[PDB]
Design a protein around this ligand. Sequence first.
Ligand SMILES: *[C@@H]1O[C@H](CO)[C@@H](O[C@@H]2O[C@H](CO)[C@@H](O[C@@H]3O[C@H](CO[C@H]4O[C@H](CO)[C@@H](O)[C@H](O)[C@@H]4O)[C@@H](O)[C@H](O[C@H]4O[C@H](CO)[C@@H](O)[C@H](O)[C@@H]4O)[C@@H]3O)[C@H](O)[C@H]2NC(C)=O)[C@H](O)[C@H]1NC(C)=O
Ligand SMILES: *[C@@H]1O[C@H](CO)[C@@H](O[C@@H]2O[C@H](CO)[C@@H](O[C@@H]3O[C@H](CO)[C@@H](O)[C@H](O)[C@@H]3O)[C@H](O)[C@H]2NC(C)=O)[C@H](O)[C@H]1NC(C)=O
Ligand SMILES: *[C@@H]1O[C@H](CO)[C@@H](O[C@@H]2O[C@H](CO)[C@@H](O)[C@H](O)[C@H]2NC(C)=O)[C@H](O)[C@H]1NC(C)=O
Lengths: 49, 433, 433
Amino acid sequence: VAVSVVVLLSVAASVYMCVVARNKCLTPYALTPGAVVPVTIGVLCCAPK
Amino acid sequence: YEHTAVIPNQVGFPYKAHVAREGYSPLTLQMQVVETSLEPTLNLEYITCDYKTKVPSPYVKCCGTAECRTQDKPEYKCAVFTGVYPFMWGGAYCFCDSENTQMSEAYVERADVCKHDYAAAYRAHTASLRAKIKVTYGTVNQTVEAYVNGDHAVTIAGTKFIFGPVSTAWTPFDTKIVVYKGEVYNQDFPPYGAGQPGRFGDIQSRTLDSKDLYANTGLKLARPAAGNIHVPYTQTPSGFKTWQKDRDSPLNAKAPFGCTIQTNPVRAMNCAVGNIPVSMDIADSAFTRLTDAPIISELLCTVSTCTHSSDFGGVAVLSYKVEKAGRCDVHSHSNVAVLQEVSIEAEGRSVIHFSTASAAPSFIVSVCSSRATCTAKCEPPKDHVVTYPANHNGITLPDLSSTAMTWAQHLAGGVGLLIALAVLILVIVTCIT
Amino acid sequence: YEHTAVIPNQVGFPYKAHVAREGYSPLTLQMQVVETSLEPTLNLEYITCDYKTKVPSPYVKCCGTAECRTQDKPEYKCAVFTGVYPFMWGGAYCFCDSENTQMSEAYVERADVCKHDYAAAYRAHTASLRAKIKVTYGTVNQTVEAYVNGDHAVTIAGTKFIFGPVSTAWTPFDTKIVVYKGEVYNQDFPPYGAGQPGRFGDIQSRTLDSKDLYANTGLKLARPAAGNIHVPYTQTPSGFKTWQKDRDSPLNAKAPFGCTIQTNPVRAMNCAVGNIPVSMDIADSAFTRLTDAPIISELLCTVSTCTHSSDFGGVAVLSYKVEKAGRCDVHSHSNVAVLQEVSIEAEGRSVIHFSTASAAPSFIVSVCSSRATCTAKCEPPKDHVVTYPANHNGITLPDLSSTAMTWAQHLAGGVGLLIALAVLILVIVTCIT
Ligand SMILES: *[C@@H]1O[C@H](CO)[C@@H](O[C@@H]2O[C@H](CO)[C@@H](O[C@@H]3O[C@H](CO[C@H]4O[C@H](CO)[C@@H](O)[C@H](O)[C@@H]4O)[C@@H](O)[C@H](O[C@H]4O[C@H](CO)[C@@H](O)[C@H](O)[C@@H]4O)[C@@H]3O)[C@H](O)[C@H]2NC(C)=O)[C@H](O)[C@H]1NC(C)=O
Ligand SMILES: *[C@@H]1O[C@H](CO)[C@@H](O[C@@H]2O[C@H](CO)[C@@H](O[C@@H]3O[C@H](CO)[C@@H](O)[C@H](O)[C@@H]3O)[C@H](O)[C@H]2NC(C)=O)[C@H](O)[C@H]1NC(C)=O
Ligand SMILES: *[C@@H]1O[C@H](CO)[C@@H](O[C@@H]2O[C@H](CO)[C@@H](O)[C@H](O)[C@H]2NC(C)=O)[C@H](O)[C@H]1NC(C)=O
């Protein structure tokens, strides 16, 4: 059962690292009003440009 | 040749020790113990049996008194009373109305009939084993017997075997042993002063021949009654014959590790206490020169069936291609199983019997300086209980070959790829800055 | 009443036990130790003795050969020889010059005197002390014999006495000692099967009658030279006698604490180590009712001369008033001094002899429920060496006594007052803030 819980915490840590990478790759498009965002559109649901 | 081993101390478990010696075909020895008695030392404190109240005849006088001239016996109490009118068969006794006097005494001796039914009280100190082995190898198997840690190194057939030292001398004995006719007990016997009568050890003696027993039996006299002649005494019952009831719990019952207890002398045999280290100075003659024992090459083994039985579960057959006719010893280079036999008339086919414990008999089986790997899945047994001990003593749970932990071997996976690639992608906007 | 005390474990030291049992005339008592036998528990393995190379007359023949038997005997050596042609008392013996063959044989059997001297390899252990002391309280002057392990404790004169168990379980022995005709040697021994020839333990046996025996005496026989009929044979001589002449260290010249060794049974005597616990169950009958006690008012003390000796050097007369006289007692209420007799004869004034080791004692006094002090300076003795041990087991050097310590009392040091003035002038510096 400890194997089960360490698997749970490890996969949660992996998802945390991945979403933090996405945020540190995405957040620098917050300012600069014209938000012309490229084909990286696979993330960042479209806001009013 | 000097070579040592570490064998377990369990009756009947066949142990194998394999010797890789140079310039000769390899050698296999087998040994198993039977009567591993822990004969302890012993000491003495005192003895104890029943008693007998040696009462003499009573003494009277007609209007004349007496006193108690002392007598150096054990428990020689005495008294003297007045006011007696002792009838007899012929009725009255004398003519003196109220001046007559009574004399009596009592003294107790260690009763003669306890010379052959006694109880003994011992202190006790460290014990020493006595192993008795069969040594079961290529020369006509001989039997040896030894004190395990006297280091007294008996010899057989040109070879000098030493044993021990045994660990911790773990004993099923307290330090205040008491022994009855064919049994032993653990008690706290009273320290030579019977501060309570009516108990065990109420009377004592240093031996069967000491001339002075000690009794705190609590014996006082009384007064004779009206009319008749007798000697009234009131003392407590015999602490011995009332201790023999409340024994209720030998060391024969509560003995740990199954040690059978015997008397004359006291001894505890066939105990499963720990194990034994052994060393050997092996005679150089009893080997075989490797130009004569055949060198079989081009072999790979197989298996038939496996079982977590106790007696002998798994059978595995082997294939090898002969070059000269002869014989060869076999061995398994790990603890995961033991083998029913020692050698083989090595002509082509070879059937052997092993005993696995739990899950996966990973094997290295050796034939005359040839190694061969072997694995096998198993079928667990269906029975519940048996009437004989185990032969697969090397209890080992885990393994890794193609069935166990394989889901873990696919489970590890994942994470590191994601994080490493994710950060090395993170840099693409955070290395230009 | 019950009380507990300690006693120093040597010979000669008189010890005083002054029970303070209120409501009664006070009481002191004396115990003196006159033996300490310290025996360990023997456990032997083998013995030794010189052997005898017993050889029968040699078998001779010509004109054909023979063979040999090798029956079950100690070290049966035998061989035939090809070409032995001898002379004789007259002429010759055969005429088969190329066929004269002689057999010879010899073996080893314990000598005649092996029934009379040996060296037992005792694996002794777990020593246990004994004592023969004498106790004197009021109407008692009788001795007693006591074991000192906590168990054995009986009586004297209608009172119960218990001795021990010990303070420190120490032995002046080793684990694996050897004995001889009257001595003890603290050395190793061969392991009963490693009897390398020439050194100790070249032959051995479990007892005097173990009808098979170990031997590794290197015996071998050669062929004779022509003419004379005899038999040659070579081996190292009987190493027991070699070990006899190089013993070089007995225990009676090396054992510590001067605790001398005796044998039959193997024991040590007068060990000057440690102390003994003791517990008394003392009966009332020894006491005396404080109504009938000597009443003594206005007790004082004084001294005459002190001698800082080994013997009872100090003489101190004692001033004390009287109102009714009797049998009084006296005891010192520290560990520093000791007193000579346990009582006085109460008449006006008394003389006592006290002993010390520190030249400024302040043993106070205790006399019949009246305690009062008196101190004295002393002086070293003119002598250097003596011929009896100390009687002053309280060898406690530094007493205060206000004689040499009074200089350290005159090391007072009011410069702390000077430090206080420094802090105060700091304060009045600060008061103008
Ligand atoms: C049914 O059968 C049993 C077995 O024989 C009897 O038990 C024994 O009775 C005999 C006879 O008394 C005992 O033998 C005596 O033992 C004495 C002390 O015990 C020690 O020695 C024995 C070996 O002899 C050891 O096994 C034991 O551990 C002790 O070390 C010896 O002192 C006696 O020797 C005699 O000769 C010497 C020298 O002259 C004298 O000084 C002695 O006093 C004595 O005369 C003798 O050896 C034997 O020990 C008993 N065995 C036990 C108790 O287990 C039963 O008695 C019998 N039934 C009946 C009803 O009698
Ligand atoms: C040397 O090793 C062999 C093993 O190969 C030992 O052998 C087996 O020995 C026992 C006795 O020691 C034999 O026992 C009994 O035999 C009787 C018939 O005489 C039989 O009725 C009993 O039921 C029991 O079998 C046994 O048969 C024999 N073989 C097997 C397969 O167990 C041998 O004892 C060892 N020692 C010596 C000195 O040979
Ligand atoms: C205790 O009493 C005994 C005698 O009742 C005193 O005697 C010893 O007497 C024996 C008689 O054979 C002599 O062999 C000893 O040499 C005596 N010993 C001493 C030390 O004198 C004994 O002195 C008394 N104990 C005392 C007075 O303390």
